[PDB]
Design a binder for these strands. Structure first.
Ligand SMILES: Nc1ncnc2c1ncn2[C@@H]1O[C@H](COP(=O)(O)OP(=O)(O)OP(=O)(O)O)[C@@H](O)[C@H]1O
Ligand SMILES: [Mg+2]
Lengths: 437, 437
RNA sequence: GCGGAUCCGCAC
RNA sequence: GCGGAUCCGCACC
RNA sequence: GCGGAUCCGCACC
RNA sequence: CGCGGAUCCGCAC
């Protein structure tokens, strides 16, 4: 009962406390003071500026507004100077407009140069767009900032908050547009129960329609899909979650889950009872950001899954896990072992030249005719999915992601049986197999 | 060695001696005296009437001519009454067209009733062309009767003589048409090396052309394919044999092959080396004619084969064996065991009604979303191909042929391992698996 | 009987 | 996956 | 200025 | 293969 009581308690988990707020205001005031000493033009943007930031995620964003006549090189050099001059400690990121990330009075700060611009139609960067996003949202989001926080909390608790490749979920900007459109958490959730994979939500035009894909129209740029990196399966998960929530609302939807964590002996028994082949490809993690690594782990998994398909090991699902030192690609197959013998297709009976060649190979068994065509019994190179993947991975490393493939080329290990359960992959195995807690 | 030395030596084991000719001659006159006494129209046809029957395969075809104003009932009654009166001892065993099969002074005789007809179109019985085949062949075949016998011997020795369902090979009539068309064995064999699955041989127009299938046009009826029941694989086998024969001619081509005959222990070790599941379905032979039986064993084998494919046991080949008392359906599969768990497909995420129903079923493991669609891990009833077929044959007996299925319903047994290698099916197993000498 | 085509039913 | 029907084709010569 | 990856499109009948 | 686009990123040469 009392969805309202639940949302009241959910806000406690999600609204920054008075101390975190004070710390942000003090950093902001100081930052303004330092910027104003330099005579510079600037805007505070983002979640801090709109008071929509989540408990524990305090960060200030300052965009430095330069004349459009300035060159990109001038933008970088001027901006980097001002950033470095205005922060307690600092560090430089990005290329194009490189920006300065640092601290002011314990608070994380981003100082970003961009062109000022009168109109949204003069955008030659994503960061040129950010001030327009803010300008569109400030004043439309006032009074609803806690609705935004509820939505962000709901998504974060369920592992689908963030558009970055590791998550492929809902961006903070997206969450704010949805609150502007529907007017609250709860109305978003009620309506989302009827979203489809062809739903188009058009903020600026004040409408919903049907399209080719799930598409949230950026009110600052009609050709841009704010939900571009929201995966189909995460869209599906959110819609399912919204239907569950309205059927039986609970504070549990806003609390992050903590893994099953079961004995390796119970896990051994589960795998035994399923009768499947369960194994991992272990290799050293490439030294690359998550946004490069995760799509490559997705590719590697997919390629090996497809190899297992072709070689008739009948894979069920794949999964992956990246630790700080190693990466793991996990597979479960319905076939533990396949026959040594297989059938190799030959030519039609009427192709004399190639029939003679086909029949000339020395084989343990006699070729045979079936349905007008010659076939031969030949011997497989590998007989288990573990052995098959060892071969594919050593041979086709190059197709398994640029950096992941190069890592596998240097070293990989195939792990199965009881040795796999001692690896730090138990939560992924459980989820992949649908183990009830 | 050398074709013409071989063919002269081949004629010895193919041309019947006087001893056998006299018994046929004596039998035909004794038969002729009995038919003349009754005063019924009769015609001698087939290989005996044209002196093209194979050594040690003497049989005499006599055709009773009836008017078209009789009907199929009277045709049957009066035709069988005559054959029984005319023969020493008789059997009445046929699939459709009535005829008496018996003996006259130690010689096989078939007494077949048919209609007279002005011309061999719009036929009434099914054997009504045979008197027209005889008229077409007597005269054209004179001087070529030993060439026919060579061809029949070549085919019989290689298990592909006869158009009956047990063989699905070349008929005697087809052999005679080919020798008339090409002029000889050797020329048939030479030209057969370039037959394809779209080769049309039109004897009446004296030409070969391309069609939709392998078609030997009946000079008596241009709509009739004399090779209708020659299977694609036996055509291929023939074409292959002619190529081999012309590259290295041998008298072995005209001699029957002895069975492979090997010890159950070698047979066991071969199966272990192949890594396959080998098993048989044993049931009692229905009391029916071969021309109904063999097609039904083919269907039953095909249905079970297709079951094994669907259930992901990856069958390699099948075969069958009919003995006096029992029939056997043989299978070799690449998968000896499959996991208990499999994937059941559920609805798309949008389809709330069906998602709810799908998600409400009790299961050991949690359902999951994949590519916009719900899936569940469920549990197989069986986990080996033998267990699968036990289920399928107990439950789908009715679809395994009319008589064959009805027998399988009253009793069947699945046999594998050591106990299979004692069943009288070693020859068929060896042929299935391509076992060498 | 078996197969092909065409239709009808049931189970998806 | 199965269960009927009809027409045609094929085997039994 | 550039740089990185992943997915898609395009060209090669 | 490469080129181009989209997406999520980074300091790049
Ligand atoms: N499947 C068939 N196709 C065409 N004609 C057939 C067929 N079966 C029988 N006949 C006709 O009936 C005749 C006798 O049939 P039969 O089965 O006795 O073969 P055959 O020609 O006598 O050769 P043999 O008896 O030596 O095997 C044939 O010559 C033929 O004209
Ligand atoms: Mg005969």
């Amino acid at each position: 009962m009392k969805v309202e009581e639940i949302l009241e308690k959910a806000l406690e988990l999600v609204i920054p406390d008075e101390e975190e707020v004070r710390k942000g205001r003090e950093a902001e005031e100081e930052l303004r003071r330092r910027l104003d000493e330099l005579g510079v033009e600037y805007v505070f943007v983002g979640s801090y500026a709109r008071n929509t930031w989540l408990k524990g995620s305090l960060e200030i964003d300052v965009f430095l507004l330069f004349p459009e006549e300035f060159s990109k090189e001038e933008l970088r050099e001027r901006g980097l100077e001002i950033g470095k001059a205005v922060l307690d400690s600092y560090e430089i990121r990005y290329a194009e407009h490189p920006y300065v990330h640092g601290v002011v009075k314990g608070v994380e700060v981003d100082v970003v140069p961009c062109y000022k611009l009168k109109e949204p139609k003069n955008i030659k960067s994503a960061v040129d767009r950010t001030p327009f996003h803010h300008k569109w949202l400030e004043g439309r989001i006032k009074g609803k900032e806690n609705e935004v926080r509820l939505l962000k909390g709901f998504l974060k608790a369920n592992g689908i908050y963030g558009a970055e490749y590791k998550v492929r979920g809902f961006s903070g900007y997206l969450c704010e547009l949805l609150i502007v459109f529907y007017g609250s958490f709860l109305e978003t959730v009620k309506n989302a129960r009827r979203w489809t994979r062809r739903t188009v939500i058009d903020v600026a035009k004040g409408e919903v329609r049907k399209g080719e894909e799930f598409f949230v129209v950026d009110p600052v740029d009609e050709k841009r899909n704010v939900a571009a990196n929201l995966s189909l399966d995460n869209l599906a998960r959110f819609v399912h979650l919204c239907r569950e929530f309205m059927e039986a609302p609970s504070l549990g939807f806003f609390k992050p889950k903590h893994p099953l964590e079961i004995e390796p002996e119970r896990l051994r028994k589960i795998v035994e009872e399923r009768g499947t082949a369960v194994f991992a490809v272990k290799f050293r993690k490439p030294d690359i950001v998550d946004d490069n690594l995760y799509p490559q782990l997705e590719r590697a998994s997919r390629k090996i899954f497809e190899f297992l398909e072709r070689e008739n090991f009948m894979p069920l699902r794949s999964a992956f896990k990246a630790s700080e030192e190693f990466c793991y690609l996990l597979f479960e197959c319905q076939i533990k072992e396949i026959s040594r013998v297989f059938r190799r297709m030959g030519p039609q009976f009427e192709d004399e030249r190639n029939v003679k060649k086909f029949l000339s190979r020395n084989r343990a068994f006699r070729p045979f005719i079936e349905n007008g065509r010659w076939w031969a019994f030949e011997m497989r190179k590998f007989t288990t999915p573990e052995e098959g993947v060892r071969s594919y991975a050593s041979t086709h490393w190059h197709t398994l992601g640029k950096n992941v493939g190069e890592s596998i080329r240097e070293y990989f290990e195939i792990i199965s049986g009881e040795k796999l359960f001692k690896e730090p992959v138990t939560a992924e195995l459980c989820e992949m197999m649908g183990v009830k807690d």
